[PDB]
């Protein structure tokens, strides 16, 4: 055992959501081990809070329409996934949205509480062409883990839903994109060692370095039963 | 050796005269890394001499394209040998088959 370990060289930040981190030099073939383990941990197994289940008045099914709304309801159910939320006390809670008149229905017009934080108040949901039209719905938000689509959930549930409950894809994990890359570096005589350049992009609720260290901690805490 | 060949390995390996082939039948007497001494059968011995053949193998040598020529003994001690066999693989043979 004559191990070799790095000196974190660069973290060059592009915005509040983007980042890229180089790291150099690693023993030969230790680029891919670390890159791959981190990527799988980030995509599949982080915890977070997000919207799951919606109740809209006067809507029965995914195909219908409501007069006085510029969108379909498919556009609504896409605009309602990126709504980044932070819950600190509960494990699930319910929002209520109530609006009338002409104007874009931003996220600020929602009924907010003390223990729930919305991190992009400018986010759009729907438009209202007719000033004689109103909108009134209620939203269910839950805390979980990973990524879970809707077909799996509906196959799992045979419950006799009150006709009007629509189900969304969940996006619990707070990472938009991660991608690594491994290229060659040098130490005085040896031209084999590897530098690793990961490139990460998350929504609100988490600053990138925070995400990377929490993932690495998850993995080491898994391994802790062998070292000693 | 090659796992898939066309049956005509053995003729090219023998008739190219690079492997040391037995001269008369017998039973091997003394095997070493650089010579083999074989003792002939009685039926093949004409009555002048005592009937031993001696093969001096050719160890590492230059081939006029600058590569290595050498030969390896292919039989153990005290096992019979019939006329026409091979007793020493050449530079690029294997038990009498061209293996390239």
């Amino acid at each position: 055992t004559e191990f070799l370990k790095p000196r974190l060289v660069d973290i060059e930040q592009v915005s509040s959501t983007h980042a890229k981190v180089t790291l150099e030099p690693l023993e030969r073939g230790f680029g891919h081990t670390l890159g791959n383990a981190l990527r799988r941990i980030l995509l599949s197994s982080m915890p977070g809070c997000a919207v799951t289940e919606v109740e809209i008045d006067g809507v029965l099914h995914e195909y219908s329409t409501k007069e006085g709304v510029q969108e379909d309801i498919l556009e609504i159910l896409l605009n309602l996934k990126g709504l980044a939320v932070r819950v600190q006390g509960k494990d699930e809670v319910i929002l209520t949205l109530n609006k009338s008149g002409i104007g874009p229905v931003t996220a600020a017009d929602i009924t907010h509480d003390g223990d729930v934080e919305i991190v992009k108040p400018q986010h759009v949901i729907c438009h209202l062409t007719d000033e004689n039209a109103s909108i009134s719905m209620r939203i269910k938000v839950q805390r979980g883990r990973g990524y879970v689509p809707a077909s799996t959930r509906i196959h799992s549930e045979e419950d006799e839903r009150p006709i009007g409950r629509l189900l969304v894809d969940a996006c619990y994990s707070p990472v938009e994109r991660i991608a690594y890359n491994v290229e060659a570096a040098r130490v005085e005589q040896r031209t084999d060692l590897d530098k690793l350049v990961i490139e990460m992009e998350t929504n609100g609720t988490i600053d990138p370095e925070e995400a990377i260290r929490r993932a690495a901690t998850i993995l080491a805490e898994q391994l802790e039963a062998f070292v000693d | 050796k090659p796992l898939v060949g066309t049956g005509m390995e053995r003729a090219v390996a023998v008739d190219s005269g690079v492997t040391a082939v037995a001269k008369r039948g017998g039973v091997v007497q003394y095997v070493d890394a650089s010579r083999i001494v074989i003792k002939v059968n009685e039926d093949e011995m004409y009555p002048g001499e005592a009937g031993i053949d001696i093969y001096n193998l050719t160890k590492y040598t230059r081939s006029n394209q600058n590569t290595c020529i050498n030969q390896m003994p292919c039989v153990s001690l005290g096992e019979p040998v019939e006329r026409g066999d091979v007793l020493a693989d050449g530079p690029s043979t294997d038990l009498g088959e061209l293996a390239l």
Binding site: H32, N36 | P2, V4, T67, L100
Partner: protein
């Protein structure tokens, strides 16, 4: 005849098997051929050209 041989040793008749990957551990999407070629050196070495 070659397929009778392949079926004598408990190998897939089609000739091609499933290969995983070395770096990521995922599976290649489609079956892949595997076998035993017989290949040769040639004496156009590099140490005589540079």
């Amino acid at each position: 005849e070659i397929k009778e041989l392949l079926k004598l040793g408990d190998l897939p008749t089609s000739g091609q098997i499933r290969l995983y990957d070395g770096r990521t551990g995922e599976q290649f999407e489609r079956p892949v051929t595997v076998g035993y070629m017989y290949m040769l050196k040639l004496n156009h070495l590099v140490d005589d050209k540079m």
